[PDB]
Amino acid sequence: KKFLPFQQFGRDIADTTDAVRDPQTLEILDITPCSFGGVSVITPGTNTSNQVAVLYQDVNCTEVNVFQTRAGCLIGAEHVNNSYECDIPIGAGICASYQTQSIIAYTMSLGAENSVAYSNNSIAIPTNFTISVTTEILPVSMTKTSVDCTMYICGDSTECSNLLL
Amino acid sequence: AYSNNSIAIPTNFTISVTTEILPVSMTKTSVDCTMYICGDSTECSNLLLQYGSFCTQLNRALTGIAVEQDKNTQEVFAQVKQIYKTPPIKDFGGFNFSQILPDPSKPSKRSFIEDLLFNKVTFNGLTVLPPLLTDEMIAQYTSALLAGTITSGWTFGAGAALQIPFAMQMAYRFNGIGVTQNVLYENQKLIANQFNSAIGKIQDSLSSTASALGKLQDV
Amino acid sequence: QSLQTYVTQQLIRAAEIRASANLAATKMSECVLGQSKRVDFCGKGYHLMSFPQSAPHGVVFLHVTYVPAQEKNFTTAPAICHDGKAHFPREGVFVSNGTHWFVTQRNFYEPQIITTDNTFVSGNCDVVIGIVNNTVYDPLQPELDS
Amino acid sequence: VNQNAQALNTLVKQLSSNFGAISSVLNDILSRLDPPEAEVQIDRLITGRLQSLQTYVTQQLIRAAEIRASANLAATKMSECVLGQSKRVDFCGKGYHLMSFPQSAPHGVVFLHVTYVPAQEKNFTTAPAICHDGKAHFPREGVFVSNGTHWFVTQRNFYEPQIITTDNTFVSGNCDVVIGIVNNTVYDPLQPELDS
Numbered sequence: 001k002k003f004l005p006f007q008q009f010g011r012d013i014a015d016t017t018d019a020v021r022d023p024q025t026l027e028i029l030d031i032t033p034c035s036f037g038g039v040s041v042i043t044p045g046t047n048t049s050n051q052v053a054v055l056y057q058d059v060n061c062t063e064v065n066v067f068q069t070r071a072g073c074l075i076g077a078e079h080v081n082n083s084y085e086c087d088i089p090i091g092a093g094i095c096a097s098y099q100t101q102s103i104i105a106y107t108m109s110l111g112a113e114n115s116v117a118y119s120n121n122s123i124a125i126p127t128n129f130t131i132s133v134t135t136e137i138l139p140v141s142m143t144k145t146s147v148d149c150t151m152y153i154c155g156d157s158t159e160c161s162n163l164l165l
Numbered sequence: 166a167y168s169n170n171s172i173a174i175p176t177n178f179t180i181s182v183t184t185e186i187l188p189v190s191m192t193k194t195s196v197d198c199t200m201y202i203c204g205d206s207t208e209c210s211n212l213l214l215q216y217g218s219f220c221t222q223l224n225r226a227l228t229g230i231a232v233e234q235d236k237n238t239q240e241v242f243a244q245v246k247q248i249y250k251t252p253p254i255k256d257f258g259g260f261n262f263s264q265i266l267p268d269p270s271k272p273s274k275r276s277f278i279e280d281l282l283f284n285k286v287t288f289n290g291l292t293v294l295p296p297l298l299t300d301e302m303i304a305q306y307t308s309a310l311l312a313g314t315i316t317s318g319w320t321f322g323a324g325a326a327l328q329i330p331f332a333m334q335m336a337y338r339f340n341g342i343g344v345t346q347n348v349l350y351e352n353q354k355l356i357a358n359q360f361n362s363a364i365g366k367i368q369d370s371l372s373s374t375a376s377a378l379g380k381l382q383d384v
Numbered sequence: 385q386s387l388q389t390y391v392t393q394q395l396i397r398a399a400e401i402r403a404s405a406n407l408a409a410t411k412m413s414e415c416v417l418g419q420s421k422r423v424d425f426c427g428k429g430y431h432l433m434s435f436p437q438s439a440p441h442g443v444v445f446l447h448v449t450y451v452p453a454q455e456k457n458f459t460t461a462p463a464i465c466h467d468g469k470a471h472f473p474r475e476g477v478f479v480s481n482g483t484h485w486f487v488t489q490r491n492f493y494e495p496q497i498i499t500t501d502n503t504f505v506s507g508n509c510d511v512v513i514g515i516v517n518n519t520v521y522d523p524l525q526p527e528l529d530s
Numbered sequence: 531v532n533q534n535a536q537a538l539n540t541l542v543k544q545l546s547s548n549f550g551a552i553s554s555v556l557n558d559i560l561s562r563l564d565p566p567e568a569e570v571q572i573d574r575l576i577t578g579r580l581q582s583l584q585t586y587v588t589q590q591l592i593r594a595a596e597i598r599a600s601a602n603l604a605a606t607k608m609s610e611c612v613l614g615q616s617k618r619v620d621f622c623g624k625g626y627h628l629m630s631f632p633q634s635a636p637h638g639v640v641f642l643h644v645t646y647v648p649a650q651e652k653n654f655t656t657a658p659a660i661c662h663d664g665k666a667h668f669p670r671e672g673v674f675v676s677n678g679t680h681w682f683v684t685q686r687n688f689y690e691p692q693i694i695t696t697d698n699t700f701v702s703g704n705c706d707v708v709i710g711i712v713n714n715t716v717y718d719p720l721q722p723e724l725d726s
């Protein structure tokens with residue numbers, strides 16, 4: 001950083017410090033935050049198992065049975081080169097699942113592949129049909145809450161109510 | 166030119182291609198309020214905890230939104246049970262889908278036109294999570310829907326996929342709009358040449374017009 | 385107060401985008417996996433088919449639409465007379481080129497000679513407003529006689 | 531039912547929170563501090579409790595503009611698809627739609643969509659048109675299929691083949707124009723009846 005002679009420090013757009021001039025040695029230093037991320041616990045559900053695997057979000061594995069995803073560093077989950085339907089989602093194409101046992105991590109299967117038997121002169125036609133009853137479920141109504149504001153704030157207190165007004 | 170006795174009837178047509186652009190998700194932001202509000206201070210944290218569940222529920226709220234951005238991208242693209250694919254030979258009646266079917270030469274599974282669509286759009290407890298489906302897992306579903314469409318019409322929506330010759334699927338199409346299919350066959354070289362010409366104008370309009378994705382750039 | 389504001393802006397924004405996601409899913413279900421008679425819902429013109437394309441955070445449809453692009457004025461009538469009975473098209477519409485009457489499909493000019501296969505009969509020349517006199521050909525009589 | 535119980539429990543729990551005050555219990559600001567000091571503490575509990583409700587209410591309003599969009603879509607499905615039959619693809623289950631039966635659930639609707647799905651199937655060779663007397667013939671209510679030795683015409687969504695006739699077909703132009711047209715013979719049921 002090409003600092004001016006009179007400038008002692010630099011600030012970021014969040015007004016916290018970006019850089020400083022060292023007062024003992026003539027040099028300009030950056031300051032960077034200590035590395036941080038969310039801790040997320042891939043859980044096979046306590047009724048099935050009590051293993052868990054931990055995703056340290058966004059970090060490179062360096063600052064933390066390990067796997068670097070594009071989502072962060074995943075620990076306690078076993079990478080697999082096959083694909084399956086996404087049992088617990090993670091990110092950037094990865095999901096996890098619990099399999100015969102360990103927690104495994106892999107790229108999720110979008111669906112079974114099917115190249116189509118197309119040509120300029122051939123058709124398929126259904127000879128039989130299947131009447132299927134499919135359920136579809138939709139919300140219609142919330143619960144009809146109403147709040148007595150002044151009993152919430154000031155319940156059993158006129159001396160509160162006189163401020164609330 | 167209305168009267169009780171005059172009608173106007175089409176003597177000729179253009180097939181036309183139009184572009185319709187929809188947002189489907191926001192960038193999956195998530196926040197730790199504690200690091201935003203009280204960055205590097207347990208004394209500030211001891212004060213902030215007195216405010217109770219405002220700390221938690223901001224993050225539950227952004228979790229509900231972040232998870233929903235993947236529920237959106239599943240319902241929009243993952244409508245098809247199977248990854249359908251075209252044959253290597255392109256006997257589609259003259260209709261040149263090569264600009265909109267996937268290009269296998271490139272690292273991501275997108276078409277020529279989708280690569281313009283990626284060119285025309287762009288620290289403090291704050292974070293951006295990744296999408297659950299990568300841009301190439303989206304490009305695999307747009308290829309599956311498009312390969313099912315070119316080879317099998319509506320039938321892969323209704324149940325199992327049933328192949329049909331493409332220019333005979335277009336006879337089903339023209340009957341769906343009250344034009345009898347002899348109008349397609351008596352003009353098939355013209356219809357394909359108009360369609361190929363139209364797709365070529367989608368390349369040139371998206372290539373020249375840097376602002377074309379304004380509905381996405383503004384999100 | 386600067387967080388509860390931003391999380392509110394995003395909980396609102398999220399319903400504005402979920403509306404566009406539900407609209408994209410509903411376009412894709414109908415406009416792509418089907419054919420849309422729903423007018424203008426799938427681009428100007430009549431709907432043939434549409435092609436989904438990926439984009440950053442979104443979707444682009446290319447809609448393929450049939451558009452009527454050249455047109456001609458024709459004289460028309462709601463019915464024709466022949467036997468004092470009244471004749472209406474089964475499909476399509478009656479048009480006169482100025483010397484001959486023809487029947488043609490509504491969306492593409494393709495004139496045909498008027499017949500008891502191109503038309504059907506109900507009632508008579510008394511009740512129908514605007515009916516005219518013509519000469520329905522019957523494909524059966526040349527073949528009965530020969 | 532979970533969110534509309536959880537936002538209530540969250541809003542009850544915010545009664546225990548101190549908000550920077552001496553205590554969250556209202557009698558124990560009053561029975562401890564004199565009114566000049568007690569008002570400066572209670573103004574904290576009022577600003578806290580009130581910002582609690584305004585956030586809870588903003589959530590129930592944003593939530594109501596979500597259950598509303600669900601209920602409009604439940605009304606639109608009941609209109610177009612219980613009270614009718616829908617030609618919209620995938621709008622009333624995966625299938626072609628026959629009908630549906632709506633059922634009540636606590637705070638919701640539960641459709642039973644009944645849909646016709648194409649099951650078992652066979653391949654065929656097929657033709658855009660057929661020749662017979664230089665004129666080109668096209669189907670009327672179906673598509674042309676060869677079983678391997680005989681041409682037929684059938685309805686596009688259920689294999690039920692029939693003899694190709696001028697009752698099952700119509701004509702336009704000639705065989706020079708139609709790409710992929712095949713030579714075949716069309717039966718006319720008038721000819722046995724004109725020979726008899």
Ligand SMILES: *[C@@H]1O[C@H](CO)[C@@H](O[C@@H]2O[C@H](CO)[C@@H](O)[C@H](O)[C@H]2NC(C)=O)[C@H](O)[C@H]1NC(C)=O
Pocket residue numbers: 127128129
């Ligand atoms: C369509 O498929 C159904 C089965 O899904 C066939 O019905 C079955 O036929 C076998 C004998 O072939 C019986 O043992 C089963 O009990 C039948 N099941 C039912 C529900 O009827 C049906 O015959 C097939 N239809 C056609 C036209 O091939």
Ligand SMILES: *[C@@H]1O[C@H](CO)[C@@H](O[C@@H]2O[C@H](CO)[C@@H](O)[C@H](O)[C@H]2NC(C)=O)[C@H](O)[C@H]1NC(C)=O
Pocket residue numbers: 176177178179355358359
């Ligand atoms: C319908 O319009 C199209 C143009 O949109 C006509 O096709 C063109 O015909 C001219 C000669 O008249 C040629 O110079 C062009 O190259 C043709 N264009 C294409 C894309 O093939 C077509 O002939 C018209 N049809 C009728 C019946 O009028």
Ligand SMILES: *[C@@H]1O[C@H](CO)[C@@H](O[C@@H]2O[C@H](CO)[C@@H](O)[C@H](O)[C@H]2NC(C)=O)[C@H](O)[C@H]1NC(C)=O
Pocket residue numbers: 255261263264
């Ligand atoms: C489909 O359109 C593409 C152009 O987008 C055609 O590709 C060109 O083909 C010629 C040979 O005919 C080559 O010399 C060009 O270099 C190609 N250009 C590009 C951009 O690839 C293609 O031929 C068309 N396919 C069909 C079946 O008509």
Ligand SMILES: *[C@@H]1O[C@H](CO)[C@@H](O[C@@H]2O[C@H](CO)[C@@H](O)[C@H](O)[C@H]2NC(C)=O)[C@H](O)[C@H]1NC(C)=O
Pocket residue numbers: 481482483484
């Ligand atoms: C209306 O259309 C008919 C043809 O469908 C035209 O009549 C034909 O005209 C040509 C050219 O003179 C003759 O070779 C044919 O023998 C005629 N056929 C019949 C049945 O008469 C008629 O000329 C057209 N009228 C106008 C004003 O365009």
Ligand SMILES: *[C@@H]1O[C@H](CO)[C@@H](O[C@@H]2O[C@H](CO)[C@@H](O)[C@H](O)[C@H]2NC(C)=O)[C@H](O)[C@H]1NC(C)=O
Pocket residue numbers: 465515516517
């Ligand atoms: C169609 O032709 C008939 C005759 O076949 C026309 O009938 C005439 O109607 C007028 C008005 O009432 C009478 O004065 C004539 O005596 C009728 N003619 C006969 C032979 O009885 C009928 O008007 C014609 N319709 C049109 C629309 O021109």
Ligand SMILES: *[C@@H]1O[C@H](CO)[C@@H](O[C@@H]2O[C@H](CO)[C@@H](O)[C@H](O)[C@H]2NC(C)=O)[C@H](O)[C@H]1NC(C)=O
Pocket residue numbers: 677678679680
């Ligand atoms: C194609 O369909 C026809 C009609 O069903 C089949 O021809 C008949 O075959 C039976 C024996 O299975 C004979 O008794 C009939 O007399 C035949 N009818 C005619 C009009 O020839 C034909 O076998 C089918 N083709 C194949 C490859 O199965």
Ligand SMILES: *[C@@H]1O[C@H](CO)[C@@H](O[C@@H]2O[C@H](CO)[C@@H](O)[C@H](O)[C@H]2NC(C)=O)[C@H](O)[C@H]1NC(C)=O
Pocket residue numbers: 661711712713
């Ligand atoms: C359909 O049958 C006709 C004959 O009825 C075939 O016409 C022949 O075409 C070739 C190539 O032009 C000529 O060498 C022959 O002289 C024609 N025959 C006659 C009797 O004129 C026609 O090619 C057949 N089409 C198909 C697709 O099989």
Ligand SMILES: *[C@@H]1O[C@H](CO)[C@@H](O)[C@H](O)[C@H]1NC(C)=O
Pocket residue numbers: 047048
């Ligand atoms: C899951 O829960 C049920 C009771 O609800 C229990 O019977 C079952 O054993 C549990 N699953 C496993 C894998 O133990």
Ligand SMILES: *[C@@H]1O[C@H](CO)[C@@H](O)[C@H](O)[C@H]1NC(C)=O
Pocket residue numbers: 060061062
């Ligand atoms: C993560 O650390 C490794 C060293 O083990 C390094 O090679 C890699 O580039 C780092 N990745 C990122 C994103 O910092």
Ligand SMILES: *[C@@H]1O[C@H](CO)[C@@H](O)[C@H](O)[C@H]1NC(C)=O
Pocket residue numbers: 079080081
């Ligand atoms: C996955 O496959 C690659 C070869 O394509 C191999 O190098 C890698 O070690 C494999 N990983 C596992 C866990 O099998």
Ligand SMILES: *[C@@H]1O[C@H](CO)[C@@H](O)[C@H](O)[C@H]1NC(C)=O
Pocket residue numbers: 169170513514515
């Ligand atoms: C159409 O309007 C004219 C008057 O402009 C009238 O003479 C004629 O009889 C009308 N014909 C019909 C079918 O309405």
Ligand SMILES: *[C@@H]1O[C@H](CO)[C@@H](O)[C@H](O)[C@H]1NC(C)=O
Pocket residue numbers: 117124651652653
């Ligand atoms: C149709 O033909 C393909 C080979 O081209 C074959 O894989 C497929 O199983 C056939 N299906 C039926 C139902 O005949």
Ligand SMILES: *[C@@H]1O[C@H](CO)[C@@H](O)[C@H](O)[C@H]1NC(C)=O
Pocket residue numbers: 120121256709710711
């Ligand atoms: C169909 O494809 C075959 C194989 O390439 C070709 O020989 C034939 O001429 C084509 N026919 C039509 C009508 O496209």
